[PDB]
Amino acid sequence: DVPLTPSQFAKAKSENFDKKVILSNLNKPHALLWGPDNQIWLTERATGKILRVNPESGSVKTVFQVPEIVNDADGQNGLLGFAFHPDFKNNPYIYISGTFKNPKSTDKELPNQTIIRRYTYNKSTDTLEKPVDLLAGLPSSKDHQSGRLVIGPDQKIYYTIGDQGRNQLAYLFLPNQAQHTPTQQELNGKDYHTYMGKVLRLNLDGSIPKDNPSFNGVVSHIYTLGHRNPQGLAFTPNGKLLQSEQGPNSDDEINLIVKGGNYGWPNVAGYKDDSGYAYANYSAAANKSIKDLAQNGVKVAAGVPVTKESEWTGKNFVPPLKTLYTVQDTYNYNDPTCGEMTFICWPTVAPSSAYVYKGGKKAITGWENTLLVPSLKRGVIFRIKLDPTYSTTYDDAVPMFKSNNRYRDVIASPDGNVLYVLTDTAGNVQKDDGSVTNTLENPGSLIKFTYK
Amino acid sequence: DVPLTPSQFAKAKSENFDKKVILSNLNKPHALLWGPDNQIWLTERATGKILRVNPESGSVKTVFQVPEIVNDADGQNGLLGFAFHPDFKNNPYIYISGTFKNPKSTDKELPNQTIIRRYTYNKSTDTLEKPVDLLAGLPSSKDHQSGRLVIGPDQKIYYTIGDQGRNQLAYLFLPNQAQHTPTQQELNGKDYHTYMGKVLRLNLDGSIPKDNPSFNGVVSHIYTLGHRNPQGLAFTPNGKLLQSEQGPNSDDEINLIVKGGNYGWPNVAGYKDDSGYAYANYSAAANKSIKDLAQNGVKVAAGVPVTKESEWTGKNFVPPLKTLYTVQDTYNYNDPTCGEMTFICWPTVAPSSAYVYKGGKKAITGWENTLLVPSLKRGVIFRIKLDPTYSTTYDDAVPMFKSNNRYRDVIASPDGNVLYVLTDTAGNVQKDDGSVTNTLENPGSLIKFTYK
Ligand SMILES: O=C(O)c1cc(C(=O)O)c(-c2[nH]c(C(=O)O)cc2C(=O)O)c(C(=O)O)n1
Ligand SMILES: O=C(O)c1cc(C(=O)O)c(-c2[nH]c(C(=O)O)cc2C(=O)O)c(C(=O)O)n1
Ligand SMILES: [Ca+2]
Ligand SMILES: [Ca+2]
Ligand SMILES: [Ca+2]
Ligand SMILES: [Ca+2]
Ligand SMILES: [Ca+2]
Ligand SMILES: [Ca+2]
Ligand SMILES: [Li+]
């Protein structure tokens, strides 16, 4: 899709909702869920705290704090995945993922691992207990961790793990592994270094499902590959799997996740269109003093090999359902017509989640079969219509709740007339007038939007 | 997708198949079917003849000639739709569509109608009898008739009817009706003038299914709208409906047809990307001597209103699964480096059909879940892979059987190792080196390709 203008974002004020801020100054709140007790549960990525919030009064209790979570002030690591067992009455389990020290790391630049872990909720002591590591030794870095964790209708764990930031900024010269898959030998050794830029599908005990797809002749935890930073993952009522993902300077994506698919990253951003992106592989550059021009591979410094999207020899490439956004090759990523901070003008929205709106007794008129996608950079939440079979999007991503906030997650109440939203404590966001600000209106908040 | 080069087309010679011409004396052969008698049936568009060919021996019979079919030498009208009832043993019906004079027409420039008609097959005399007009008074013209007629798993007729060529060449100043829909009053008077650029869904007696979708508050025969020239229509084994469609100078499409969808034409060609096309509405030009520069609306003469794809206010817009092909706004539709007939290099392939490959006990390796799309202009048959649920394409359109032929239709034998194709009698086609020729290697032929 084509980017909206600053004026088109500014008018998306959602006057048909009442806003109430329930909490602010949470410490990097990240995921929120409607709990089995019809209370709101949310995580703090930086602290490992799991908080429960009463919808009526807003009273908050720190139910548990995941010990030994590692978080860097400038990093996207910490406490990440968070899900309840779907049959919680009979299976009172909470599933998380988190950044933890890796004691066998022999790489001081990458000292941590990601672990997917199960906890048991004890209703009598009202806390979590009896941890069990389901899958450890996963990649960890400060960038593009993703870490969305959901339980599918098949009672498998689906877990997004980002490309760790390879081929940009602090990890510019590390080779991106989004396209790579393990050998049988690596699997035998539990060497999961290729579990970067993937959707994983795990048995509830952490083992490899025997019906997982095969990649390069090996069945592993990998379900799909070729992802950058897929922070959104949600099943539809008819069992399909929708997803949002952050692109580079362009081509954030809404994807339909299909078993064994290849979503193209880093060789293809968005559609395979050779439009506004090319794959510049800095790990293959002649030397590591070369500079990233940050023009999305359309123009690069001498010495870095570039591969057009159309030159990639790919298998099972699956294009996005929608891009937010795609631009022409002649697009100016340094466009001087906004300020010294051109990145705010890049044709992206930085989607942070993806939530399937299920309606209810007070369903919002017209919202049938929609996907809600919060935007960090634009300070909106998108509403994206699909057809009733969730086979295609209809029309465009409709912005809502415009504010100077970085929207991080969103759910709806069971009745469907109330939305609950998390915002980041810090970062940049685009103002009504299109310029950037790092003054956020509601830092680290839980916000309630009630349909009038 | 990005266009293949002339080199890339010329290399698609399919040396793994043996070619044999079965018939070479056909006049504008149009549709090809594997019949319920395990014979090949095919149509001649201008004569109205229905032929049956023994696939083993090659003997042929003219089973029937549809009387009073109207065809213009410079036109795409004539005998079009052709399908068997799916339970032919117990319901020996054949359904056709055709161009016929319209005795009610008061327009000497549009004197004809399209009629969807049923015939009863008499196996004792081997001919068609008892004609019955199921739906009459449909639009007719020389351009963009489409006319694919299939019967779905719901035992409804699905029928493609093109946009009649409005807003180009001889019909430049007629307002395109692809987006328009009937009022209830128009349905009462059987005024089907808005049945242009549609997929229709009809009951087997021609009536309106009671569960057809609503458009602008009215349920009609329309199932989907917003099409230009959709000549390919085919159901998958799991009940999904795939389609191919010719775009203007760009953006031929493979579409997934979903109930109630809007496929965007003429406001959107291909994706809603504002890339290489814009909607120049010559009917809205105040001056009717204005010229169409034929640069796909990117460059226009003074006086014609132009709407960008992103400026359209649309409802239920469904993007294509794949475009053949999409180019940048900087694309040159007049590239003199291509030869004096610059249209031959345009980023299109002119798909003429769409066929779901079902395999069999001699299925061609790697062709699971493929869609075969014949190309008129490039003289190839494309193979397009989808995932096993037919929810997404995988990778690109792979060209096959390159020759100096205009491929019009394609089917496969039950065992899956033989493909049968029809070729046009006349027209232009791209040669190995990219230039244009109107010398076709196999004019008006039924050809088979056998895997060896
Ligand atoms: O303008 C863009 O394209 C853009 C903007 C941002 C932004 O939020 O400022 C991000 C981003 N997302 C996170 C996150 O925690 O999800 C952290 C950052 C960051 O740059 O610090 C990304 C991206 O990561 O692709 N792209
Ligand atoms: O190069 C292109 O884009 C292109 C090329 C052709 C071509 O075949 O030469 C056609 C076309 N298709 C039919 C048909 O019978 O289906 C007739 C014609 C015609 O131009 O006479 C179209 C189009 O109709 O869009 N576009
Ligand atoms: Ca980005
Ligand atoms: Ca992708
Ligand atoms: Ca792209
Ligand atoms: Ca065309
Ligand atoms: Ca279309
Ligand atoms: Ca387009
Ligand atoms: Li005839």
CSV table of C-alpha atoms and ligand atoms in Angstrom, one decimal, chain B residues 46-49 65-70, ligand 9:
chain,number,residue,atom,x,y,z
B,46,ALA,CA,-16.3,-17.6,-34.9
B,47,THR,CA,-18.0,-20.6,-36.5
B,48,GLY,CA,-19.8,-21.7,-33.3
B,49,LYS,CA,-18.7,-25.3,-33.8
B,65,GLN,CA,-22.7,-25.8,-34.6
B,66,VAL,CA,-24.4,-23.1,-32.5
B,67,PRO,CA,-26.7,-21.2,-35.0
B,68,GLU,CA,-26.6,-17.4,-35.5
B,69,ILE,CA,-23.4,-16.8,-33.6
B,70,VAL,CA,-22.2,-13.3,-34.4
C,9,LI,LI,-22.8,-20.5,-36.2
